[PDB]
């Protein structure tokens, strides 16, 4: 029946559509490599430290050791100084 | 040198960080 | 004194196609709603979110995902039909709670085993202003 | 309250995102807040003017600063009347070439804003001459922002 | 199942005791006002016959002497056209020297300072310069003489009483029957062979009669009044035969089937006439003849009295399939009941006719010397794309008149329909996101190039010169026409239109008329503007349809009508739930779209058709071919097409297009006129009226009919309407200033 | 015979079922993506969901960068493709810091479409989403290098 | 949720309780009119705020007042 107050996850239609529930395609060895590897990046905390962290004096490091062939900003103003209005 | 440093501390470290932050504490529940 | 009738599940539902109108998750983490009625035959009617279903002759089961559809349905029931309708008010522990007629009668038709609830014994222009209930919890209206 | 806005358990309660919005633009009216006294009205209120005090004095800080470290101060001083000020310097990295040698002015080594705030006529007017004076005042100022 | 005349006799008396009873058709209306809503609701309800009665035989009735009431009116305009046509124009001076002289069919009298609009339209005349095109309709109708515009004035003027007549006569007399109207097969059997194709038919016999010859004199330099009459070609056959020598068999090769003979002046060339710049009326004429044929065929479809033919319900409902169900079964009695359908699906296609019509009067234009006068080009581009985007609008607001007030699933059901309501919210959730997609793959693309612009990156914005977005399958298509003539269309002389076929320039006294209009970046990125704005108004009307009936948020919206301002503030406010309020929220849209359709037109054709030609064929366009470099950012818009052209409307002081400058002032101010009431709402406005009564009260001059603020829907109608008006008319005095001044 | 159904046969749940929805070619490869392998360990569906885009994500900010034109550096701007997995690894690790608490069990279903009682997914748990996170952001950054590994011999470089 | 109310100027003409589309509304016995019933808000944590009742109320002023408070999924009219 499509109604039954004592399982309302198939009264309200709460399934897994599409969910497999197979086991692993993924052979071992392969699974034991990412599990040993991936393992330290499995702390959400953690992991939210080390991207912050990380990223961020990654980022201030690209920026610091930036050359002026890449970034017009470093290269800074090549010409001569034009003159302003009436002013300098 | 100092503005390539602080540049995007200011506009990208600290908005991730704040907006990271703020988030966590917005979606709480105690 | 009045006793609302069970939700009894196996009741038939109307024939219809299905639609996006329907339940959503707020059903099974939430609460859904449950519209029953008695009907004479096998007529077409509007739902109150797809279009045309076909209400089946006898006792029909309806779940809804709003109060509001299934007082609007039955709102309808009554007037175009003439038909007695329930609504319940179904949580996922599979408790019901009885909403619609609460006292068996409609609540337009005064009861007497009704008691008053927010009734205030005076005008309305005689709440007192803001500053007399200030840095108190209370509001002018609550008294 | 059990959840942001603390101050309002009626906003925590709000399961749409609602609740988030109204938590902004009501954090400041104290009156609406759960719990309120006058004493406590008063007091977040005095302590809020302490707050903008020290925002308005490290605000002008900053200007004191970026005018002595980026500006044409002392450049100007000499000329007023042909020396663009200089407000601060611009460090966008998605400028491309001509952009910096455009806004490169007053006389300065990279890209700059003109000031249209007129802090050096005034500041030049109240006896300020070098750069190492209004570094002193940045750092008073900082101070009272403390 | 017979079909026949039907009709009623004096079903409603002729008497002006209802003409003296305000509101005599609503019974809550007639009893007057207490209040001033009463005076609009008057207006509002007037013309919405179907909320006056149920009575369907009474409401199709009212909707049939009503349109007798539009024709009159539409035949008092033409007779006002050919009659100034004939006494204060200068069509004849025009008529002989046309490269030079400007269409003038208005003069204004001297009063109060005004005089100055009469301005030197050449031919010692002074007037107001026309763009509507009467004169080039006139020229390739053969007229000649004003006396001529003078007859057809006064017919006009007759078949505008003859109208007007049949209203009353057919409402107060002989009132066909209900059974009469629902007689669909018979309707379309004679509006398809009767209307269209006896017209084009009738049409196509003036052309090779009057039109042809006397264009063939006015094209050989002949002066007008030596021209011999029209009819003095249909007495003496050898003026025609001179002229074009076929007309000596006598239609003989007509019922040989030698009908390839009459090449001489039926023609497939196409391209246009070198000496016109109009398009060859040899085809013209020929296309009539086409024309008249197909219709004259496609209305003998429908089945009637005879047996032969088509029943129209037959058809809809064999056409179903797996996924529809059992479709079209159920239209033929929606179609045949609700009056509101029918205007919904003939405002759809009329109005998207009139932008069709729009695109293909600009890229073939069809009357002599209509191509070279810009201003008369223009005008009509933009008029007839502002009546196609309205009627459109209109089919929203009826489409949805129809779910709330004529549908009913228990009496006639659709099966397409019910699919439809029952998968909505995938429908415009599905549209929501492309309309998203398209405003960031489209507009987006602009901020970037004026973003890459102002940083001093044009290597890096979306260019013809950088990042190239060529529309690639469009530039296919045209190249496809050009190759067109003499391979997939070996009759066809010349290329389909101008702007498709390289090179075959055509000018004018010395004004360009049509050369291949090229594509690039810039059009690509204009065309994908197009789409959005498109595909945004779209998404606001139909999603003001399809949840006219029903939401989640309010499941009774049916109950509360078609027109109404809201359900409250609650469920976190429901403002502008109803269907109305989606056809006001879509009309802003419209004219979004179609403005900026619009400017796309005037852009793209000043850049890189318009312009003078040298004697040895060197083309200055009226602006520099900056389309390409500056219409590609926002700010190009803002500079080199809004600061740059909008010069003259603001220099026009103390010329004859002054009026354009007074009128490019007062529609920014009831544009900005049109704010007060959009963004305010009327418990503000209710409640200081109760102070300016009270001001009143004091000295014993309030009225009786109580003063009161607008309702919320008609505060938000004024708004709109404001907001339309002002807005279209600014771009109006734009325009007419600009392409007068230096077109 | 119609080819448009309710879903799942129950008629007043919001939805329905297409071709596009409910086909046995749909079925199968939507259960074959990572996401839906609820039997797996998170960690191991991050690696491969992280290995697809993060190779992906190399295309767009190569050839569309500003650096594109100068294939010194712009072949390098693989850079940034690393840094948005950085900050999507960032946005997946507050959104399970955010969604799931310690010791709370999976919110995903615990039925199947033919009612049966199913285990369900640890995807949807603070431990089995710091998995996936930590997946994710290992195959991201290792797609990323792969992609930037292969520079040649492809139309478009 | 939504605050109601009653004042005792009602009449007892029911019209708010047949106006209100989530049923909060009832109407009692009462001795204070004539027609002996006066109304009551015995549900409003299903009153979702629309203010039919107000708009059906007779009485000037109103006898029914709707103030508009803490909002839930219910006062919202969230169907998800
Ligand atoms: C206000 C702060 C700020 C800063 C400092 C930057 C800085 C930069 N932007 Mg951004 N931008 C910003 C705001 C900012 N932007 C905003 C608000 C928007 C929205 C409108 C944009 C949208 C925007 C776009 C669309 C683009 C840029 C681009 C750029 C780069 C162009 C210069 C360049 O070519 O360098 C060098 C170029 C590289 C590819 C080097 C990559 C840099 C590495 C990966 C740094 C590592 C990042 C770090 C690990 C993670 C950061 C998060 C951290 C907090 C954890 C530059 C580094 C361009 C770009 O990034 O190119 C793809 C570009 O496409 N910006
Ligand atoms: C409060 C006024 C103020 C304002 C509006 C600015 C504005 C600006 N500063 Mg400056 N700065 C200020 C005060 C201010 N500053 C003070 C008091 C100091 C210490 C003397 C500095 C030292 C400083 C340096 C070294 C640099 C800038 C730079 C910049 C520019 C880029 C932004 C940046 O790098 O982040 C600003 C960096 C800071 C260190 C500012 C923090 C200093 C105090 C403690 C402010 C308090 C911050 C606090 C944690 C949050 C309070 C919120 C807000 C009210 C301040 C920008 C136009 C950069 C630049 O010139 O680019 C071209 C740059 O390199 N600032
Ligand atoms: C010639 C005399 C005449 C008389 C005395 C009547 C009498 C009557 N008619 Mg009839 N009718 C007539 C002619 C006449 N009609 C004509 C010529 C037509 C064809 C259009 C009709 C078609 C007709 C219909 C369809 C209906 C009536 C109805 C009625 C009755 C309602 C009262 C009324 O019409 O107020 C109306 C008073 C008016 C002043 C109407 C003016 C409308 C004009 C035509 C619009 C002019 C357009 C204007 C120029 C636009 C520019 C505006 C601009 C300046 C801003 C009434 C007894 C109605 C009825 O049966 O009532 C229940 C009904 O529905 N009549
Ligand atoms: C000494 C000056 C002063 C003081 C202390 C107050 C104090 C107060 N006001 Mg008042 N008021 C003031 C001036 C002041 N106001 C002025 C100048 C105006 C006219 C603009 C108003 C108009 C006003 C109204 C209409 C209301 C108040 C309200 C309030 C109370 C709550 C404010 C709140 O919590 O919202 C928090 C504020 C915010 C979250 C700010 C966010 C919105 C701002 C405007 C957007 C900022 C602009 C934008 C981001 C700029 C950046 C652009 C970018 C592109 C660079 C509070 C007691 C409210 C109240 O409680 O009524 C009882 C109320 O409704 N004020
Ligand atoms: C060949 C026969 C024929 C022709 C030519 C027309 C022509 C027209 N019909 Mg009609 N109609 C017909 C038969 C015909 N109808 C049949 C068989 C039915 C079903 C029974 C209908 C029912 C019908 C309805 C319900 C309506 C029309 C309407 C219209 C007008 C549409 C607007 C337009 O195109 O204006 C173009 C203008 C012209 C072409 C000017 C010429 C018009 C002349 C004077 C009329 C010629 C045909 C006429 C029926 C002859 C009868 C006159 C005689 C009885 C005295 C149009 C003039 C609309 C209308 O009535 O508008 C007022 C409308 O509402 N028709
Ligand atoms: C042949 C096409 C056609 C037809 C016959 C109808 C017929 C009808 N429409 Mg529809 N509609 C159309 C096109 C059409 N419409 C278009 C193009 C639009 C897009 C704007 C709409 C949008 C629409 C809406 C939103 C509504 C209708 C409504 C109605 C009904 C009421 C009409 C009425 O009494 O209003 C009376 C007419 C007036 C009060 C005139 C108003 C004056 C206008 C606003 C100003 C005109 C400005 C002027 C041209 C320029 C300035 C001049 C000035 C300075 C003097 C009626 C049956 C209404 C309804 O309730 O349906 C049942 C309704 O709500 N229509
Ligand atoms: C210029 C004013 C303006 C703008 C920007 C919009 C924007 C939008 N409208 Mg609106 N509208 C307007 C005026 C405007 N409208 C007015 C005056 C009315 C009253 C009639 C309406 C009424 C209206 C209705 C009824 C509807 C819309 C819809 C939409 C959306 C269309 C989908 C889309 O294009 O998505 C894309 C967004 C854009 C094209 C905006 C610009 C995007 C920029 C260029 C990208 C920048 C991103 C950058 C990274 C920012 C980050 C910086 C960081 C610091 C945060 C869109 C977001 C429709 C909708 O809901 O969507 C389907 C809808 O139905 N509008
Ligand atoms: C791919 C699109 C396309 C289009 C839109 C046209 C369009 C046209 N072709 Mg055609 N044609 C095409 C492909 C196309 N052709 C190709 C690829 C070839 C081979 C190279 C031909 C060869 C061809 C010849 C020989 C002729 C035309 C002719 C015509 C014109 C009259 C149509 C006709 O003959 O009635 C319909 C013809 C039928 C056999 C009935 C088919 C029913 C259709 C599908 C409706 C017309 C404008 C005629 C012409 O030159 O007119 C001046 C003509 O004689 N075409
Ligand atoms: C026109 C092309 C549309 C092809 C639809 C394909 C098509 O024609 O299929 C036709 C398909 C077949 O229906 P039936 O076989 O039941 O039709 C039989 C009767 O209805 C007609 O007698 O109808 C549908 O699939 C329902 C519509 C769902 C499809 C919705 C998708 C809408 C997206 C379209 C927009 C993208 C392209 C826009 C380009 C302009
Ligand atoms: C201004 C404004 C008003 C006030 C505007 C009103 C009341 C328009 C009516 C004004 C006219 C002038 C009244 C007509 C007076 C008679 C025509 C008599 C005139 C006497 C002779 C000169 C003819 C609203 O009522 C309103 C309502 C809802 C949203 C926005 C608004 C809004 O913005
Ligand atoms: S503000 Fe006006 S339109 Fe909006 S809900 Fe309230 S009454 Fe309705
Ligand atoms: S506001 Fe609406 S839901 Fe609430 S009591 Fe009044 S009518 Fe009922
Ligand atoms: S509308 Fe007013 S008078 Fe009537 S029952 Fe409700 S509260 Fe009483």
Known sequence: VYFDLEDLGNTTGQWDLYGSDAPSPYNSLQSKFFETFAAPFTKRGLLLKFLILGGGSTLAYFSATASGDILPIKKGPQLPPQLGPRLG | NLPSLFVPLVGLLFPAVAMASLFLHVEKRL | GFTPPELDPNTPSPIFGGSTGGLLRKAQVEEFYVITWESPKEQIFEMPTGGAAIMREGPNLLKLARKEQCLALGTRLRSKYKIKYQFYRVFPSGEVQYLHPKDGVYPEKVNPGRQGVGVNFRSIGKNVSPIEVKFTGKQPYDL | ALRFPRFSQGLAQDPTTRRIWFGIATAHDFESHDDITEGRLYQNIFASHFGQLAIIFLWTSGNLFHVAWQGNFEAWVQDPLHVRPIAHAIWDPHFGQPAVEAFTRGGALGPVNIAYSGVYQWWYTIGLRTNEDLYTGAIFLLFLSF | ?743 | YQVVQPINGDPFIGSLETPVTSSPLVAWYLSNLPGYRTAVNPLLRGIEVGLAHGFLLVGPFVKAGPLRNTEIAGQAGSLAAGGLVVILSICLTIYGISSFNEGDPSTAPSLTLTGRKKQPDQLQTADGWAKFTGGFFFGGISGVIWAFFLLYVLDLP | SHSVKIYDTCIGCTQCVRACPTDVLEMIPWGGCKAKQIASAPRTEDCVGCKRCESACPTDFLSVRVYLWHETTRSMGLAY
């Not at chain 5, 201003?375 to 089919?395: E, K, P, Y």
């Open chain 5, 1 to 743: 199942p017979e079909v026949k005349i039907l009709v009623d006799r004096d079903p409603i008396k002729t008497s002006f005791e209802q003409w003296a009873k305000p509101g005599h058709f609503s019974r809550t209306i007639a009893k007057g006002p207490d209040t001033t809503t009463w005076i609009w609701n008057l207006h509002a309800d007037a013309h919405d016959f179907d909320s006056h009665t149920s009575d369907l035989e009474e409401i199709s009735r009212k909707v049939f002497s009503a349109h007798f009431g539009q024709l009159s009116i539409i035949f008092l305009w033409l007779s006002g056209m050919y009659f100034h046509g004939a006494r204060f124009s200068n069509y004849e001076a025009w008529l002989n020297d046309p490269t030079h002289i400007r269409p003038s069919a208005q003069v204004v009298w001297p009063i109060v300072g005004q005089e100055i609009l009469n301005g030197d339209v050449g031919g010692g005349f002074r007037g107001i310069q026309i763009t509507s095109g009467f004169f080039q309709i006139w020229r390739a109708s053969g007229i000649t003489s004003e006396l001529q515009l003078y007859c057809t004035a006064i017919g006009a003027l007759v078949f505008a009483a003859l109208m007007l007549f049949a209203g009353w006569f057919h409402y107060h007399k002989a009132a066909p029957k209900l059974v009469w109207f629902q007689d669909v097969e018979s309707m379309l059997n004679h509006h398809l062979a009767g209307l269209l194709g006896l017209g084009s038919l009738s049409w196509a016999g003036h052309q090779v009669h009057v039109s042809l010859p006397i264009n063939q004199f006015l094209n050989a330099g002949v002066d007008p009044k030596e021209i011999p009459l029209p009819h003095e070609f249909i007495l003496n056959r050898d003026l025609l035969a001179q002229l074009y020598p076929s007309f000596a068999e006598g239609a003989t090769p007509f019922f040989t089937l030698n009908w390839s003979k009459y090449a001489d002046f039926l023609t497939f060339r196409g391209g246009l006439d070198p000496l016109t710049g109009g398009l060859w009326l040899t085809d013209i004429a020929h296309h009539h003849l086409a024309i008249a044929i197909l219709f004259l065929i496609a209305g003998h479809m429908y089945r009637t009295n005879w047996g032969i033919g088509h029943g129209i319900k037959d058809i809809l409902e064999a056409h179903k399939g797996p996924f529809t169900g059992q479709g079209h079964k159920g239209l033929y009695e929606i179609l045949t009941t609700s009056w509101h359908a029918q205007l919904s699906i003939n405002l759809a296609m009329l109005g998207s006719l009139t932008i069709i019509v729009a695109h293909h009067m600009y890229a073939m234009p069809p009357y002599p010397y209509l191509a070279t006068d810009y201003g008369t080009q223009l005008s009509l581009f933009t008029h007839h794309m502002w009546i196609g985007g309205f009627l459109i609008v209109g089919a929203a607001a009826h489409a949805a008149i129809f779910m709330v007030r004529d549908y009913d699933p228990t009496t006639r059901y659709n099966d397409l329909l019910d699919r439809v309501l029952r998968h909505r919210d995938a429908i415009i959730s599905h549209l929501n996101w492309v309309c998203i997609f398209l405003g960031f793959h489209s507009f987006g693309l602009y901020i970037h190039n004026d973003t890459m612009s102002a940083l001093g990156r044009p290597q890096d914005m979306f260019s013809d010169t950088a990042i190239q977005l060529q529309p690639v399958f469009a530039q296919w298509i045209q190249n496809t026409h050009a190759l067109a003539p003499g391979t997939t269309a070996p009759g066809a002389t010349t290329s389909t239109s101008l702007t498709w076929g390289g090179g075959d320039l055509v000018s004018v006294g010395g004004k360009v008329a049509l050369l291949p209009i090229p594509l690039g970046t810039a059009d690509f990125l204009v065309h994908h503007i197009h789409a959005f704005t498109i595909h945004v108004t779209v998404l606001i009307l139909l999603k003001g349809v399809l949840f006219a009936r029903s939401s989640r948020l309010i499941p009774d919206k049916a109950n509360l009508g078609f027109r109404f301002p809201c359900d409250g503030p609650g469920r976190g406010g429901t403002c502008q739930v109803s269907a109305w309020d989606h056809v006001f929220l879509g009309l802003f849209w419209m004219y979004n779209a179609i403005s900026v359709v619009i400017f796309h037109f005037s852009w793209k054709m000043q850049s890189d058709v318009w312009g003078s030609i040298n004697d040895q064929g060197v083309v200055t366009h009226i602006t520099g071919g900056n389309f390409a470099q500056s219409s590609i950012t926002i700010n190009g818009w803002l500079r080199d097409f809004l600061w740059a052209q909008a010069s003259q409307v603001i220099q026009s002081y103390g010329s004859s297009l002054s009026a354009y400058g007074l009128f490019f002032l007062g529609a920014h101010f009831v544009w900005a006129f049109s704010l007060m009431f959009l963004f305010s709402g009327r418990g503000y406005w209710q409640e200081l009226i109760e102070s300016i009564v009270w001001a009143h009260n004091k000295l014993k001059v309030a009225p009786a009919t109580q003063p009161r603020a607008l309702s919320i829907v008609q505060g938000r109608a004024v708004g709109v309407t404001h907001y339309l008006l002002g807005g279209i008319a600014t771009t109006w005095a734009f325009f007419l200033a600009r392409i007068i001044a230096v077109g």
